[PDB]
Amino acid sequence: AMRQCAIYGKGGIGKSTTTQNLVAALAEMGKKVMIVGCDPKADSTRLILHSKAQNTIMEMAAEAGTVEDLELEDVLKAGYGGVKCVESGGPEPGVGCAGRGVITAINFLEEEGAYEDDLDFVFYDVLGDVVCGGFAMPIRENKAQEIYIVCSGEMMAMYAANNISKGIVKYANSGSVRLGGLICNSRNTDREDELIIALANKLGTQMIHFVPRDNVVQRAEIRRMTVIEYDPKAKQADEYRALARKVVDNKLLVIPNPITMDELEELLMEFGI
Amino acid sequence: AMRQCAIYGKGGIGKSTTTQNLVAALAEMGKKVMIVGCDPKADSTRLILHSKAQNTIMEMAAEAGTVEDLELEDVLKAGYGGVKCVESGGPEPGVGCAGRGVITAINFLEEEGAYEDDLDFVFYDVLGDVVCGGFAMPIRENKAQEIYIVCSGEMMAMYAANNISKGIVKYANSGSVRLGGLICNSRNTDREDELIIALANKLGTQMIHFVPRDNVVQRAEIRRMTVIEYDPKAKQADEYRALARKVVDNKLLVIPNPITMDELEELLMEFGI
Numbered sequence: 001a002m003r004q005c006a007i008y009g010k011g012g013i014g015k016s017t018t019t020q021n022l023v024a025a026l027a028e029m030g031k032k033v034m035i036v037g038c039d040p041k042a043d044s045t046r047l048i049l050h051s052k053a054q055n056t057i058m059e060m061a062a063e064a065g066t067v068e069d070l071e072l073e074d075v076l077k078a079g080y081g082g083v084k085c086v087e088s089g090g091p092e093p094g095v096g097c098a099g100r101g102v103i104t105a106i107n108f109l110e111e112e113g114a115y116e117d118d119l120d121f122v123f124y125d126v127l128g129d130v131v132c133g134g135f136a137m138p139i140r141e142n143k144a145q146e147i148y149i150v151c152s153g154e155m156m157a158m159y160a161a162n163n164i165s166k167g168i169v170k171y172a173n174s175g176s177v178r179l180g181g182l183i184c185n186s187r188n189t190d191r192e193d194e195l196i197i198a199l200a201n202k203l204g205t206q207m208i209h210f211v212p213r214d215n216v217v218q219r220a221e222i223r224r225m226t227v228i229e230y231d232p233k234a235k236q237a238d239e240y241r242a243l244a245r246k247v248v249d250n251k252l253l254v255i256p257n258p259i260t261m262d263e264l265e266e267l268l269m270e271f272g273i
Numbered sequence: 274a275m276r277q278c279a280i281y282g283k284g285g286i287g288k289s290t291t292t293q294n295l296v297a298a299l300a301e302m303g304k305k306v307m308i309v310g311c312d313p314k315a316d317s318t319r320l321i322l323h324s325k326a327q328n329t330i331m332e333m334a335a336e337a338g339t340v341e342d343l344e345l346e347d348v349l350k351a352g353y354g355g356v357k358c359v360e361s362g363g364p365e366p367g368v369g370c371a372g373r374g375v376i377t378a379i380n381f382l383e384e385e386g387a388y389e390d391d392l393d394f395v396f397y398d399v400l401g402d403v404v405c406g407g408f409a410m411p412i413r414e415n416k417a418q419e420i421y422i423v424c425s426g427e428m429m430a431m432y433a434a435n436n437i438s439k440g441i442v443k444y445a446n447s448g449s450v451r452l453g454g455l456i457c458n459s460r461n462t463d464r465e466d467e468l469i470i471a472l473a474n475k476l477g478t479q480m481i482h483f484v485p486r487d488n489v490v491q492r493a494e495i496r497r498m499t500v501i502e503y504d505p506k507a508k509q510a511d512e513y514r515a516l517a518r519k520v521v522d523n524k525l526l527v528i529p530n531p532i533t534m535d536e537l538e539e540l541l542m543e544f545g546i
């Protein structure tokens with residue numbers, strides 16, 4: 001068995017930082033993990049690889065001729081803790097559908113045998129500002145059974161969480177894609193943890209962890225590292241370890257109950273953000 | 274003549290707040306303006322209309338049968354200062370292309386004669402996290418000749434500005450879509466104005482205005498108003514008046530020069546954000 005997990009959320013909310021640090025912590029406990037980048041920014045694996053970024057399947061297929069001319073051992077790269085890394089890529093802005101590379105990448109990985117039984121986890125890092133095209137494909141086509149949404153007390157981030165939840169509900173009659181939890185990536189606002197707990201309860205899920213804002217993240221990422229690798233003694237390293245433990249132990253996977261915009265506005269008014 | 278202007282930027286950066294306050298200031302000086310909402314969130318006109326939001330062309334066409342059964346006088350609504358307001362809408366998350374409603378809306382407005390000569394400005398408020406589908410259509414199809422990008426010292430917001438600029442460059446051989454400027458919507462970070470000026474210079478444009486972070490925005494929006502209407506004496510009202518003056522007077526419209534991610538990272542390192 002392997003658990004297929006996807007991390008969704010609005011742009012800039014902390015998906016790639018949270019995913020790579022979460023995964024580094026899983027590797028540190030002895031789990032075998034693959035990260036599949038599903039965001040056109042294509043820097044979802046750089047902290048594991050100590051790299052600028054990673055060349056994408058779309059780019060490599062174009063240089064090789066076709067995606068059939070690519071070998072898995074050429075596209076998958078291993079970094080910290082043996083974590084395996086791949087980037088989908090996508091077309092340039094203004095050209096075609098921004099999520100088209102996700103479909104190509106996941107189909108390539110499936111056909112070429114990347115989902116080997118020894119993997120414990122696969123994490124997809126998915127753009128979540130629109131839920132369509134290849135960005136909806138992990139939900140539509142039952143690739144990510146456990147969705148975790150990174151958000152914050154920011155209204156836009158909560159709106160995005162509600163939008164992603166609506167996409168999960170839309171495909172509830174097939175496959176087994178479920179909402180696993182909300183991850184609060186803090187903006188140092190008071191009662192922010194309470195706010196995201198409240199949102200999770202309304203959706204029918206849970207806040208699996210509250211990730212503090214910590215400058216050690218920037219110091220690690222300037223050096224192309226996770227905090228787990230950069231400073232294993234850091235308080236923030238223990239925060240990601242706690243998040244990883246709770247993901248491993250999580251048993252609550254639900255069809256969420258999306259809320260109205262009135263309910264969202266009431267949440268923010270209540271917690272005075 | 275009328276100036277067709279589009280406001281792009283990442284989600285939650287301040288597009289709708291900036292656009293509606295900018296437009297309220299234009300109406301206050303005696304300009305006739307239409308706002309076309311091109312973001313699925315569909316709350317781009319609520320501060321002009323004093324409303325929860327606005328029912329969308331996609332929604333109204335479905336209730337009426339076809340878009341041909343809609344009349345312009347039924348969909349366009351006038352609010353503060355006589356500003357005319359319309360929302361595109363879009364499909365629910367996980368269903369079809371999130372930008373499909375933008376194409377339907379702009380074509381409806383053109384055919385039904387919404388672009389009356391007496392208009393001075395049209396502002397499109399466009400989702401900018403992906404540049405594809407209907408969200409690229411104002412650029413691809415030459416609807417918004419002047420693009421203004423709202424951003425901040427946030428790396429994701431600067432990345433989005435660079436992505437939108439690449440889309441402008443892609444369609445430079447046809448039509449006349451141009452980059453008009455960057456609008457810095459502050460996060461109260463030091464040297465943030467300097468950073469966005471530097472980014473604009475590298476792209477070949479300008480920072481047209483630095484909008485401060487001001488709590489009066491939240492107090493106005495709780496009451497479904499622009500700051501211009503809510504507190505015309507506010508310092509922040511004068512900030513939006515200054516932005517509107519500089520948009521009116523702006524003559525620099527360029528084919529931008531997008532930068533590498535190395536150049537972007539160098540910018541942030543330099544200005545110590």
Ligand SMILES: Nc1ncnc2c1ncn2[C@@H]1O[C@H](COP(=O)(O)OP(=O)(O)O)[C@@H](O)[C@H]1O
Binds near residue numbers: 016218221
């Ligand atoms: N808990 C945190 N503390 C400090 N900085 C953070 C934290 N989480 C994310 N960041 C920073 O926020 C920025 C955006 O994070 P990222 O993971 O790239 O967002 P996304 O992948 O959702 O677009 C990055 O510069 C990252 O270093």
Ligand SMILES: Nc1ncnc2c1ncn2[C@@H]1O[C@H](COP(=O)(O)OP(=O)(O)O)[C@@H](O)[C@H]1O
Binds near residue numbers: 283287291
């Ligand atoms: N200059 C500002 N000062 C204070 N709050 C702001 C400012 N600009 C935007 N906001 C707030 O930021 C949030 C997002 O702004 P919005 O215009 O809705 O973003 P977008 O339309 O780009 O998604 C809103 O709650 C808005 O009130």
Ligand SMILES: [Mg+2]
Binds near residue numbers: 017
């Ligand atoms: Mg990312």
Ligand SMILES: [Mg+2]
Binds near residue numbers: 288
């Ligand atoms: Mg908006």
